Ligand binder design. Structure first.
Ligand SMILES: [Cl-]
Lengths: 68, 65
């Protein structure tokens, strides 16, 4: 009975036609050192919360720092 | 007029859950990434994959449609 797709978003950025061209190459986009400590968690479009990337046993996940 | 923007998401994962198991979720709970990716999205379109490096991100061949 599964409804929703949760998305784990490391980084978002609004981007210009210029900066778009520059990435079609292989030019580096600069993330802070601290990106993995605010991974946005998005359901079908909307932002639900935010958290640090964690590893439990086999899998990866996001320990929730803030929510709804 | 070239004052245009595209909103990009750097997605590292997906998980299918039940709309009814949140907000049973609160702070401290771990949500697991069942499907693991490194794709770039613009709205629904996937544009291509990306590699995380010490500076941030480098993107492989990125689609433009
Ligand atoms: Cl898919």
């Amino acid at each position: 009975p599964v409804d929703v797709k949760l998305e784990f978003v490391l980084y978002r950025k609004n981007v210009t036609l210029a900066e778009l061209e520059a990435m079609g190459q292989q030019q580096l986009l600069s993330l802070p050192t601290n990106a993995e400590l605010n991974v946005e968690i998005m359901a079908n479009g909307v932002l639900l919360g935010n958290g640090e990337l964690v590893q439990m046993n086999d899998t990866l996940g996001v320990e929730i720092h803030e929510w709804l | 007029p070239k004052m245009l923007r595209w909103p990009l998401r750097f997605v590292i994962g997906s998980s299918d859950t039940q709309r009814s198991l949140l907000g049973r979720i609160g702070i401290g709970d771990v949500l697991l990434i069942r499907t693991s990716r490194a794709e770039v999205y613009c709205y629904a379109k996937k544009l291509g994959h990306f590699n995380r490096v010490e500076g941030g991100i480098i993107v492989e061949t990125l689609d433009i449609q």
